[PDB]
Symmetry: C2
Subunit: 208 residues, 2 copies
């Protein structure tokens, strides 16, 4: 089945877990403690010396976006055709770009950079609002009319930014409604409310 190996944080595993939960999939969580990591053996066995590590049967995967695409491909959350698949990738790459900036802020200079970051935020979120506006008025998903792995990734990005800059989605009605709508999906709603998700810190350094 599935096994996700990661630190005890939401971080880069938040989206794929939301995906797994919402899709009614069962998975095992192998928590890696900072002590176990600093020991060296696991790190060395990891392709790029990092987590998340994912196992699907004897297929071992590394890289959060690789796991998302893999699950999207095998579970049918990758568009209805090649054109949609490309748009899904375009959205995910955009999400990843902002996530990189967010991770940098959180870990390198949260203190001095938070203000400029939050100021620049609207311009960073605008593209997703625009995408929504061009797809059935933003009433369905980020691409097409079926959920895709990019939806889960974008949802997580929006959720963590609401914690970082409360009200950042107020100026974006489509994104706002989008978060509410997806967060309401039964299995996902249950998962988001569960201790498994709620009792995990967003990041590893206590900042958010």
């Amino acid at each position: 089945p599935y096994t996700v190996v990661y630190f005890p944080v939401r971080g880069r595993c938040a989206a794929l877990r939301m995906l797994l939960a919402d899709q009614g999939q069962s998975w095992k969580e192998e928590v890696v403690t900072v002590e176990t990591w600093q020991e060296g053996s696991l790190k060395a066995s990891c392709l790029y010396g990092q987590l998340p590590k994912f196992q699907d049967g004897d297929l071992t995967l590394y890289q959060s976006n690789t796991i998302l695409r893999h699950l999207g491909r095998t579970l049918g959350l990758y568009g209805k055709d090649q054109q949609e698949a490309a748009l899904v990738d375009m959205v995910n790459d955009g999400v990843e770009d902002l996530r990189c900036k967010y991770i940098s802020l959180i870990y390198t200079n949260y203190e001095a950079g938070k203000d400029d970051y939050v100021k620049a935020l609207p311009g960073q979120l605008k593209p997703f609002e625009t995408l929504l506006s061009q797809n059935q008025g933003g009433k369905t998903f980020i691409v097409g009319d079926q959920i895709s792995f990019a939806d889960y990734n974008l949802l997580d990005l929006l959720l963590i930014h609401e914690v970082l800059a409360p009200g950042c989605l107020d100026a974006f009605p489509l994104l706002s409604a989008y978060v509410g709508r997806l967060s309401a999906r039964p299995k996902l709603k249950a998962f988001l409310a569960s201790p498994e998700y709620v009792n995990l810190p967003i990041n590893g350094n206590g900042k958010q």
Copy 2:
């Protein structure tokens, strides 16, 4: 057909162009000059305010990796099955991670950071040598026995690092042979030797 809209540099378009050339595809190049960009209109029309922009018929794509995956998907350069497709993604994500570090070095602090970067390089390249060693002895491609979009992206990454740190592939026999072997593919060899490629700077700030 295909149209690539980008600045007059190899940068993030190098790999997809190598891919197009080697696959015998025809494409149009729309060069964007720094003057045209600073004018504002094009930037504003770009989803994430950036290039490359790619057109395949009326499908407009942004994000270099989205274009690579799209071409991989439509041209059959994405593995023979889902398992290989996942490994292809894992390699491309790894390539993109190192490319991000390279781009950072080149544009933010080439001066003070070059030494530490080149020192850390072997550890960054090792994973790809390892992948090669586990796939038919590294005699074919990065994943499976057919070329994939990740091959072109990895090849470009290796080529630009040879310019940044001459001899960085000396310690990696599989990667070395890999570059030589792929660079020898007829159409690719011709493309790499052509003015279209050779007369373009690797980066936009004259550093490499």
